[PDB]
Amino acid sequence: APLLLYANRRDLRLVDATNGKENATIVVGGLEDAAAVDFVFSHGLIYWSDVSEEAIKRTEFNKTESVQNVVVSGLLSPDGLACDWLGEKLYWTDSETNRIEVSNLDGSLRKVLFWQELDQPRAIALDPSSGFMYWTDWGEVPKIERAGMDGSSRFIIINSEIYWPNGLTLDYEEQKLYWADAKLNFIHKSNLDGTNRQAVVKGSLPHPFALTLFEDILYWTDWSTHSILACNKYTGEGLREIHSDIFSPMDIHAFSQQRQPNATNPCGIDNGGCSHLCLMSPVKPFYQCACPTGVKLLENGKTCKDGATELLLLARRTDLRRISLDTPDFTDIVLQLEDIRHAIAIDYDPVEGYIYWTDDEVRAIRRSFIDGSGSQFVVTAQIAHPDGIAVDWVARNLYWTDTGTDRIEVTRLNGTMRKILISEDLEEPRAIVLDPMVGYMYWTDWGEIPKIERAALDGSDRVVLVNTSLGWPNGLALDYDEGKIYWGDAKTDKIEVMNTDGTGRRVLVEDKIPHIFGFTLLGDYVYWTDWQRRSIERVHKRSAEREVIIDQLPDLMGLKATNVHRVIGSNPCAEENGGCSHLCLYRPQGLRCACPIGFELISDMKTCIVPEAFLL
Numbered sequence: 278a279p280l281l282l283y284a285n286r287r288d289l290r291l292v293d294a295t296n297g298k299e300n301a302t303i304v305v306g307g308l309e310d311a312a313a314v315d316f317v318f319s320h321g322l323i324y325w326s327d328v329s330e331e332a333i334k335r336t337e338f339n340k341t342e343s344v345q346n347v348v349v350s351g352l353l354s355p356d357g358l359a360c361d362w363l364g365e366k367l368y369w370t371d372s373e374t375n376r377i378e379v380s381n382l383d384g385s386l387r388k389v390l391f392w393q394e395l396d397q398p399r400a401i402a403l404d405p406s407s408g409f410m411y412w413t414d415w416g417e418v419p420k421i422e423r424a425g426m427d428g429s430s431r432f433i434i435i436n437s438e439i440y441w442p443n444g445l446t447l448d449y450e451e452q453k454l455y456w457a458d459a460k461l462n463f464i465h466k467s468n469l470d471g472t473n474r475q476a477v478v479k480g481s482l483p484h485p486f487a488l489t490l491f492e493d494i495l496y497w498t499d500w501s502t503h504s505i506l507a508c509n510k511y512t513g514e515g516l517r518e519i520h521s522d523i524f525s526p527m528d529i530h531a532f533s534q535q536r537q538p539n540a541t542n543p544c545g546i547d548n549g550g551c552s553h554l555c556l557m558s559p560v561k562p563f564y565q566c567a568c569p570t571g572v573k574l575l576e577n578g579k580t581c582k583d584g585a586t587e588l589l590l591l592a593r594r595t596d597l598r599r600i601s602l603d604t605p606d607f608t609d610i611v612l613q614l615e616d617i618r619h620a621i622a623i624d625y626d627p628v629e630g631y632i633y634w635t636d637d638e639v640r641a642i643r644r645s646f647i648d649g650s651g652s653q654f655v656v657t658a659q660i661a662h663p664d665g666i667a668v669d670w671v672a673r674n675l676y677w678t679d680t681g682t683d684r685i686e687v688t689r690l691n692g693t694m695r696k697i698l699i700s701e702d703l704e705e706p707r708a709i710v711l712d713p714m715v716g717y718m719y720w721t722d723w724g725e726i727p728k729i730e731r732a733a734l735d736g737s738d739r740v741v742l743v744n745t746s747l748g749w750p751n752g753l754a755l756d757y758d759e760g761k762i763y764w765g766d767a768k769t770d771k772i773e774v775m776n777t778d779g780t781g782r783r784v785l786v787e788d789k790i791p792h793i794f795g796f797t798l799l800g801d802y803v804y805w806t807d808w809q810r811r812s813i814e815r816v817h818k819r820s821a822e823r824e825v826i827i828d829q830l831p832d833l834m835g836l837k838a839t840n841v842h843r844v845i846g847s848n849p850c851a852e853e854n855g856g857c858s859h860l861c862l863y864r865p866q867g868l869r870c871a872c873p874i875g876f877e878l879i880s881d882m883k884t885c886i887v888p889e890a891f892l893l
């Protein structure tokens with residue numbers, strides 16, 4: 278007696294028994310807007326997607342409430358879902374992020390398979406027997422596609438006689454795959470190639486939402502009629518509708534251990550396949566090696582590197598995000614954090630892996646471990662508009678500018694030992710970069726006469742690098758072992774370059790530049806945000822040519838491209854803090870020790886104490 282399992286927006290539901298007594302059972306319930314479901318029968322698992330919650334979840338078939346969030350991020354319209362009961366993976370399409378991804382059956386090791394040339398991928402079917410997954414994307418040009426469940430050999434099989442190509446489901450007995458259509462109202466049938474395209478229920482009668490099958494019988498949903506239907510597997514004949522008065526049936530599968538034929542796993546329980554991901558494959562070994570998103574795989578294969586090497590950190594108004602720079606996929610942003618109101622500037626310290634960022638409604642500076650409970654505060658007092666921040670990764674101090682108080686200030690990374698280095702009456706400091714070797718700190722500031730200044734790392738030797746033809750200078754990156762210094766200006770709308778001493782100057786490209794501007798350099802490439810702050814460009818600094826790695830991401834505020842772990846340069850401050858008891862600030866001549874407000878430097882030129890304290 279084939280049990281049918283189907284989503285229903287408000288709940289998941291199991292029905293049929295032997296098609297009698299109308300025992301539709303509410304498997305899970307109290308959902309909000311469920312679309313897709315699937316199961317791994319052996320383990321008694323039921324998965325679904327929820328379009329209002331943008332999450333994918335799972336439960337235990339037994340009498341239990343047990344529900345676990347499985348994906349809860351990066352999803353917009355997950356409308357297709359397929360479990361791999363063999364290789365033990367989870368696949369799912371997302372019709373709006375136009376991605377196709379995979380994970381372990383617990384949401385972990387989440388790899389994006391495909392992401393290019395996808396228009397509204399929906400229905401999805403796995404063939405773990407072979408290494409083939411099938412899905413349908415439809416849009417300006419609809420099509421059914423095949424590829425390996427490993428990301429290989431993406432083949433377009435059926436690309437004609439289709440419009441809104443509908444549910445996918447395969448006959449393992451016959452090595453044929455069926456598909457429907459939500460517009461042209463047919464059911465068809467082919468070989469697992471694009472081959473032998475036969476009609477099973479041609480003619481405009483079927484208006485199926487989701488197809489399944491079990492022993493010669495095609496079942497499906499017609500949301501319109503609020504019904505479930507069924508007919509011969511071989512012709513349209515037999516077309517009765519199973520008992521069905523059902524409130525918006527969506528996705529549906531035959532809930533039967535026979536619809537998942539088990540077999541030999543291309544990796545054993547041995548190996549566990551690789552180090553992170555063993556995905557099935559048509560390729561000779563019949564399994565393939567994978568790392569999570571943005572993570573590259575060693576030349577040996579089978580072993581994934583540790584995390585990404587470079588990394589592009591985003592600051593939106595109300596979240597932070599990182600895009601990796603190790604892989605082609607890019608547009609895999611991923612985010613984190615709570616209580617972020619209005620983020621402005623961002624920077625990072627590869628040594629301890631803390632992200633630092635400014636928020637100018639909260640008026641505070643904070644740090645985190647990326648996707649880590651890193652989150653502590655750092656500064657919260659006497660702040661206005663922290664429009665720019667710089668980590669000094671050698672002396673282990675944190676610099677930040679302020680627009681409201683027109684100051685530059687330094688603290689140790691933990692926000693201790695605060696000390697005002699620069700405080701100008703007219704001009705007001707905006708964007709800031711550091712050179713802990715060579716001992717310089719450069720910064721743009723706006724004002725009645727907008728200039729670009731520089732100084733030693735303690736504010737001492739103020740030199741005005743740029744003075745003329747600058748309206749509102751914005752971003753300000755630094756090319757180190759090339760001694761150039763890139764910046765932007767919102768008013769004039771052109772990205773210029775320069776010699777480290779303010780001489781090699783020249784427009785690089787023209788550009789319409791936002792007032793709040795993200796702008797950073799790393800490895801021949803420059804990254805900035807567009808005028809509408811919904812997209813990020815990658816530009817060759819040596820070659821001048823542009824490109825857009827990610828759009829449709831509003832409220833972009835500030836960017837930082839950075840190595841993870843990797844660090845470069847040094848100076849004597851790295852030696853037990855220069856010998857200074859509090860603040861050690863490097864200069865071209867040589868480091869100078871400093872003190873928090875109220876303290877006093879003793880003739881050591883190394884030590885601070887609070888005056889009128891002791892008598893010694």
Ligand SMILES: *[C@@H]1O[C@H](CO)[C@@H](O[C@@H]2O[C@H](CO)[C@@H](O)[C@H](O)[C@H]2NC(C)=O)[C@H](O)[C@H]1NC(C)=O
Nearest residue numbers: 319362363534535537538539540541542543545
């Ligand atoms: C479930 O599938 C697995 C994987 O094929 C079966 O486990 C073993 O599979 C090998 C592969 O041919 C057989 O040689 C063994 O005989 C299988 N185990 C044994 C000793 O039964 C497993 O049999 C399948 N479960 C069933 C019974 O349906």
Ligand SMILES: *[C@@H]1O[C@H](CO)[C@@H](O[C@@H]2O[C@H](CO)[C@@H](O)[C@H](O)[C@H]2NC(C)=O)[C@H](O)[C@H]1NC(C)=O
Nearest residue numbers: 672673689690691692693694853854857858859
């Ligand atoms: C961050 O704060 C910690 C304590 O919360 C500081 O740790 C030591 O603090 C004493 C007291 O001034 C200093 O004499 C030590 O030099 C500090 N240790 C180190 C590692 O230098 C610390 O100074 C602050 N930031 C650092 C440097 O970790």
Ligand SMILES: *[C@@H]1O[C@H](CO)[C@@H](O[C@@H]2O[C@H](CO)[C@@H](O)[C@H](O)[C@H]2NC(C)=O)[C@H](O)[C@H]1NC(C)=O
Nearest residue numbers: 726727728729740741742743744745746778779
């Ligand atoms: C920005 O303008 C100031 C003031 O005009 C420049 O400072 C001096 O400018 C006068 C001419 O107006 C020169 O004779 C001096 O040589 C300048 N100062 C010195 C001694 O360097 C300042 O140079 C301008 N900023 C820059 C460097 O572009």
